Amino acid sequence: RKQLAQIKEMVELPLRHPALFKAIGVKPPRGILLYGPPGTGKTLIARAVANETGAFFFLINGPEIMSKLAGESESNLRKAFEEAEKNAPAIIFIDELDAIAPKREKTHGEVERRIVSQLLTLMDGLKQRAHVIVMAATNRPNSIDPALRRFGRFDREVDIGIPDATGRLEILQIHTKNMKLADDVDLEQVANETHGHVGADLAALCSEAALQAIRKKMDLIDLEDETIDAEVMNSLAVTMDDFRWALSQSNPSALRETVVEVPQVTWEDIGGLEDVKRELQELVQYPVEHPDKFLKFGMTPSKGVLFYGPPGCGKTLLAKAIANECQANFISIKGPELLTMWFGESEANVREIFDKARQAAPCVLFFDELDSIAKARGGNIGDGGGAADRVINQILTEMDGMSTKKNVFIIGATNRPDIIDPAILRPGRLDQLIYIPLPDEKSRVAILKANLRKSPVAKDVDLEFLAKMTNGFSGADLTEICQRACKLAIRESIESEIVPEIRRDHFEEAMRFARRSVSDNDIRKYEMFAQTLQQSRGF
Amino acid sequence: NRPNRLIVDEAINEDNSVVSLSQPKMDELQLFRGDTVLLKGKKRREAVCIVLSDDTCSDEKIRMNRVVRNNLRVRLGDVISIQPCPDVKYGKRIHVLPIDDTVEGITGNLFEVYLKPYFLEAYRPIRKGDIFLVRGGMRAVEFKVVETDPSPYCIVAPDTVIHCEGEPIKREDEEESLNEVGYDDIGGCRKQLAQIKEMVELPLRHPALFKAIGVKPPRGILLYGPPGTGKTLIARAVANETGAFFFLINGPEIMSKLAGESESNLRKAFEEAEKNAPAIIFIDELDAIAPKREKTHGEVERRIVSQLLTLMDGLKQRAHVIVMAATNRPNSIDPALRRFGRFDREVDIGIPDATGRLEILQIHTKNMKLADDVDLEQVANETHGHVGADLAALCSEAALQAIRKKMDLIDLEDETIDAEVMNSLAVTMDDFRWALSQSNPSALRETVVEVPQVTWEDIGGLEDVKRELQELVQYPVEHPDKFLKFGMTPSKGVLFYGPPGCGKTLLAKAIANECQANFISIKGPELLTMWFGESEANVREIFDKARQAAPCVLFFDELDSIAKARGGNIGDGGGAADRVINQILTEMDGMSTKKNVFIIGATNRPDIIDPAILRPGRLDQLIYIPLPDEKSRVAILKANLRKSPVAKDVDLEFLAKMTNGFSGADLTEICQRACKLAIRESIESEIVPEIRRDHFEEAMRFARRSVSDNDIRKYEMFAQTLQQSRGF
Amino acid sequence: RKQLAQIKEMVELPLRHPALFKAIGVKPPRGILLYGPPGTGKTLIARAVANETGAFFFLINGPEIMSKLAGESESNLRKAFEEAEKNAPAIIFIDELDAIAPKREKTHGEVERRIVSQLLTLMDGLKQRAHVIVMAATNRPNSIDPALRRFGRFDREVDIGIPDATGRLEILQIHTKNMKLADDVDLEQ
Ligand SMILES: Cc1cc2c(C(N)=O)cccc2n1-c1nc2c(c(NCc3ccccc3)n1)COCC2
Ligand SMILES: Cc1cc2c(C(N)=O)cccc2n1-c1nc2c(c(NCc3ccccc3)n1)COCC2
Ligand SMILES: Nc1ncnc2c1ncn2[C@@H]1O[C@H](COP(=O)(O)OP(=O)(O)OP(O)(O)=S)[C@@H](O)[C@H]1O
Ligand SMILES: Nc1ncnc2c1ncn2[C@@H]1O[C@H](COP(=O)(O)OP(=O)(O)OP(O)(O)=S)[C@@H](O)[C@H]1O
Ligand SMILES: Nc1ncnc2c1ncn2[C@@H]1O[C@H](COP(=O)(O)OP(=O)(O)OP(O)(O)=S)[C@@H](O)[C@H]1O
Ligand SMILES: [Mg+2]
Ligand SMILES: [Mg+2]
Ligand SMILES: [Mg+2]
């Protein structure tokens, strides 16, 4: 939705008013570069915006250029540009570009850099003259010739990520609108258990689910005829088990990367921690929702917040809770995934993970368990020197190039804040330090009312009573208690088959098998860094 | 709607023309057990068969064998009409003559050995124009009738005389030979075949049905499996047994010709399929067609890659055409071809297990009649890494050994061979024994997909962990209705820990077979030898095989091997983390909770593994394997000698009564020593063959302890206090 | 000695009885791959087993294929296979193969993988039809295209190592038989 409107801002404005641009000095768009993983819809949206404007549209994807003999491939591309000039206004769209201009460490073949030079010539000479726009699409950032990303050829780029749950909701109906659904069927719950599906994945899933429904009646009906009657087409309708069996197959097996979703946790949804709820807003909410402030008094807002404390305190959720109330998206970067993408002595994939948070403004970036990088360099005892890395210096240098007026907010999280370099803790990258203490009574009662929201828990139990005994337990312990109680209740529910509700004794058994996620000595270690922390800066 | 139409499906019985049905259809058409049934098809032809009764079957379908499928010209996915015919028929005179197209090299009388055993205990009627295939003499030959008694009135009875003439007739174009591959010529891959049966014949037998509906039919299907799995055989069968056109281009004939016409040949191979719709396209090898990877050598070879991408990208609906390709390894296909719309659906065909390998022997030795003392059961149990090609080569060379064993002394030098000695030949025990002792089993070994055969009664003891493993595996497999009414979510990972030699691999297998799931065993050192240095690139594909083979239970045997290489005993200055551990712990988090894939880890020193995989959401439940108790100690002894003639003088419970502080390795090695000493005195007495009490008595005294005592209390001090180690 | 008898088990059996294999279902051998260090005798034994059977034998080693101009090298190999079909039974022997199909980390040159694809085509299409066997020899295991070691092309391999003392005894006399030796001379020590 966000990616479409800003195309609506740069395509139809310089097309529906050709003579308006001829008098004004504003240079219209020429080149638009597309992004996104394969199957995102790089072709569908281009075809829609090229066919629903009335202007001419010409299609050349990539391979038909390299499929023909040498010599005429360049001529075809050259004529495809002059044919668009005469019938102005026109538009040009290129489906895949990564296999067209691989002017990188490959540099194989004489004829293939010829077409790269040909396209560079055909775009470099594009003065105003007529009203023509070329557009290209690709799958990864490190696949476009850097000579094409210069100003005047490809200076404006849009990143289209994997849709979230509410983004994936509309994709189901925009393809199943001709499929009338029964009363007991809804598309809401089925689009909630998935988190990495794109339009192509959902289209394939619905197609095969419909095939399953077709065969479920063709196996017993056995109607062998050429033409089919409409008296049975209308009676057919997909059921619950079809969408259940569709996802249990191998079609969800796809590629997973940084997903852009919006959180759904707000102030009433959580409880307690009034001492840090009062403070996080002071440094996030106001310099987002109050543009008039923060420049009359001078000064400048922060960019970075480092979260620290006992493990299992729910730092990721605490960071999400503030990002959704400022009308910003959220990208979750957990520790080990930034380590598995490191390989050895070659990553070359850092600069592009920050731009997605920039095009999707406003956005709140989160680094979950940043302590993973220090794990690999040196842990526990450590090496002879500092725990610095070529992946840490490159990100701490990258976060300093941004202007203070951008709304991008980076948030770090760690669990052992004594081994991280003060280099990122410098006054100007990570200024404010915020401590996450153990959950109090108001949060302990809330976590229990939240982790069983979809269970038929009887009213015989008391929610406040559990938090009354539970004092020295962390979020992991509070969750695993409920997990154990539900696990024992679900066993007796099946055993009675040889009524299905959770009773007080079910929580009572889970009470006795409780353990402590954290010890005691590490606690006072954590709140001795809280009051005296500015002393560690610089030394 | 005339409820008599039945859907055609292949039969499972390995015999002559016998059609199986269900029980409601038995009483619906008022037909008895043994009766003459009438079958009607298209092209105005009549065929007869026998209805067989079955109860353990599917809901509603017929079982249509290939012998009369060619007789009635009916393929898979068509319709068949059945009706009773209570007509009394008696056979007196039948005339049959072979065709001179396949009788080369056969001399002598062929009616007293190929027609006598085939007719007795059959009572199978015949019609005019029936094409039935018989077996015998290392080959299969079909018969055809030209003139006989007026059809029908033909029943096999001993009172029917025969007489040969000695003049074959020329075969016409009305029928086809049965020597080609059919749907019944493939065995070993059963799950992989049915889901192809779900995506090939459905969008082909109903072309106009898809034109009205909005469901997009399949276009590209990518095959997998090690070489020799059968990537060509199944494709040829599914392309030839559907009636649609099939065109073959493997890979090398494209690159063998001169530059310029190779692309033209591929371009014309696609337009020739459009006009004669419906058609199908199959590509034998693809890894050598599109190597758009670190190779990128040669100008003309990426030209054909772009040509094929162009020819598949432009494939709109139009006609009903499907392209299929096969390969040998996952890291050999151009990633540009695996996009949505070209290759989005993939099937993994692994090495068949023992019961999978059983059928491959007979589907190639059916023409080889075997003696009484020979069976194919035991010979397919000692092997674990053979595919169809390996077994075919093994049987071919075993037959050659049998041929030479009589050609060395018979010395019959003649052009044509007689059938009087072909029938007398039969392979023996020593042939299959000597076949495997040669170098033909030397092949490539990888992850094999087998089903365990150990259940609750097969093992004993450990009631405290049998009671618990089921609570977290069995119910959220066999009870789909649960685990969402109460909310919550099932687990994915279980980590096994304790003294070495406790049988953790077997304990993990015991639960996987009772939930109707396959099993893949990943032992420690094999995932280390595939690591090399700074380059593995082979992790992402080892998890998808457990996903396509749902349900499946994955097992990591001795995960502690990875920590061994990074740092052991003392350890390094930091954590024992690795780029092979982070990439798998990140991969196991991308999966949805509703998948039925279950990963199980096993270790022996659970104090040096990173808590990163022990996070609450990857490895939540921790299960301890204690020392075997009395009930398991008696069971292991009754299990490890199941194939030995142990006398009744010994007592099974008595041994477990002395044995208290011994582990599974010790319990096994005691029996190994007892058998080893008994087998020596058995041979020494030759200068009776049963195990006596003293044989176990000597093994009793030479017993050792696999584990010490101090490590024990170390193991059960982590059992009660383990949640404290999470996070620190 | 051991390596020879098992060739005696797979060459003359499917050649001296052509019509016997036509009636039975046993698939005769097609491809036989040789091994051994250079000078082991990969050519001598092939010539002996091809000349002492009466069947036709055609020789193409390796380099004459790559020595000629581009375009006719493939035609020569193609015609060398059809010339053997008409005069059945026949046999085909290739002297060196490591320099014919280097489909490995080398992958240099356009025309040289062309002949690899040509030979793969000419062997892949070999159904029963006549009684023809192709044989090839090499010097090291990591020099054959893995695509050629598949089932049906090269699935049976023999390793011929360096002969031992008693193995080396006979080699002296099989070449010095025309050299009459004195009384005080012996080839044992
Ligand atoms: C499933 C869940 C697990 C978990 C864990 C854990 N160690 O697994 C830790 C913290 C919160 C957790 N939650 C959780 N999840 C949510 C909420 C919520 N309550 C408020 C809260 C969160 C963090 C802090 C204080 C209080 N708690 C609120 O609703 C949305 C999701
Ligand atoms: C050959 C064999 C060796 C072995 C060993 C070993 N250190 O070699 C350890 C554990 C079981 C072993 N088995 C074994 N194998 C089997 C069974 C069985 N008994 C039940 C059992 C298994 C593990 C645990 C408890 C009890 N034991 C059961 O039948 C199938 C195979
Ligand atoms: N965002 C989307 N919304 C709706 N349908 C979509 C979307 N993306 C893809 N589809 C469907 O998927 C089909 C194929 O889309 P593709 O063009 O293959 O996707 P893509 O992003 O262009 O990546 P390629 O072209 O496959 S490399 C389209 O015809 C649509 O039916
Ligand atoms: N699963 C199988 N069942 C029965 N026979 C098989 C099977 N797989 C292979 N065969 C036999 O082996 C012969 C050769 O099969 P291949 O096509 O070579 O196997 P493949 O899996 O296609 O790998 P290639 O083509 O050799 S790279 C077939 O003609 C069959 O006789
Ligand atoms: N095993 C052997 N027994 C007897 N003479 C041999 C043997 N091997 C080689 N020779 C002799 O050596 C000569 C040359 O043999 P070669 O063909 O060169 O050996 P090779 O094993 O084929 O390796 P190449 O062809 O040189 S790469 C033959 O003509 C024989 O005279
Ligand atoms: Mg597209
Ligand atoms: Mg094949
Ligand atoms: Mg030589």
Numbering used by the authors:
A (entry chain G): 210 to 707, 728 to 768
B (entry chain L): 21 to 707, 728 to 768
C (entry chain K): 210 to 398
Provide text from the study.
In order to assess the effect of CB-5083 binding in the context of full-length protein, we carried out cryo-EM studies of p97WT bound to CB-5083 in the presence of either ADP or ATPγS. Importantly, the N-domain is in the “down” position when either ADP or ATPγS occupies the D1 nucleotide-binding site. CB-5083, as an ATP-competitive inhibitor, can exert its effects on p97 function by blocking the allosteric conformational changes required for transition from conformation I to conformation II. These additional interactions explain why ATPγS binding initiates the sequence of quaternary structural changes via interactions at the inter-protomer interface. Although CB-5083 binding site overlaps with the nucleotide-binding site of the D2 domain and shares interactions with some of the residues that interact with ADP/ATP, the key inter-protomer interaction between R766 and the γ-phosphate of ATP is missing in the CB-5083-bound structure, preventing the generation of the type of quaternary conformational changes seen upon ATPγS binding to p97WT.
Critical functions for p97 include the translocation and restructuring of proteins from large cellular structures such as organelle membranes and extraction of ubiquitinated client proteins to facilitate their degradation through the ubiquitin-proteasome system. Here, we present cryo-EM structural analyses of four disease mutants p97R155H, p97R191Q, p97A232E, p97D592N, as well as p97E470D, implicated in resistance to the drug CB-5083, a potent p97 inhibitor.
